[PDB]
Design a protein around this ligand. Structure first.
Ligand SMILES: *C/C=C/c1ccc2c(c1)C(C)(C)c1cc(N(CC)CC)ccc1-2
Length: 133
């Protein structure tokens, strides 16, 4: 339940639009984002993670070390400066992004070959499920 390595293909994605709207993403761009196939590629070695989300028009790449706060600029998303921190809460991988938005971050539950991802911003939660390819 703690190994997130691999290429992860989307199976479900609920309230993607509400989460993007909470981040203030342009309405026009949200309507395209909702159509795009998203692939999550994770390289995990000890505390070190390299995460890459890919689609036809936008990528989102982040590298981090568990337990080490990092300055982050969401240049390809909402373009904000946040102080990010990723930690283990049991077998749940938890990101908090401190900044303008409240309740901002994500949580990842790895259950064998399924990855459950909950992205939060403000009062919005988007729930995604991926399957390991
Ligand atoms: C463990 C997963 C964390 C994480 C961080 C950022 C993003 C994601 C996952 C994705 C794959 C859900 C994602 C998608 C997008 N785009 C839509 C607006 C497509 C590139 C941005 C950021 C993240």
């Amino acid at each position: 339940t703690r190994d997130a390595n691999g290429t992860w293909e989307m199976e479900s994605n609920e309230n993607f639009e509400g989460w993007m709207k909470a981040l203030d993403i342009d309405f026009a761009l949200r309507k395209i984002a909702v159509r795009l196939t998203l692939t999550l590629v994770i390289d995990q070695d000890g505390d070190n993670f390299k995460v890459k989300c890919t689609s036809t028009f936008w990528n989102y790449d982040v590298d981090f070390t568990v337990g080490v706060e990092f300055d982050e600029y969401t240049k390809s998303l909402d373009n904000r400066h946040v102080k990010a921190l990723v930690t283990w809460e049991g077998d749940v991988l938890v990101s908090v992004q401190k900044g303008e938005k409240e309740n901002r971050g994500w949580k990842k539950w790895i259950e064998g070959d399924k990855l459950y991802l909950e992205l939060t911003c403000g009062d919005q939660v988007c729930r995604q499920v991926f399957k390991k390819k």
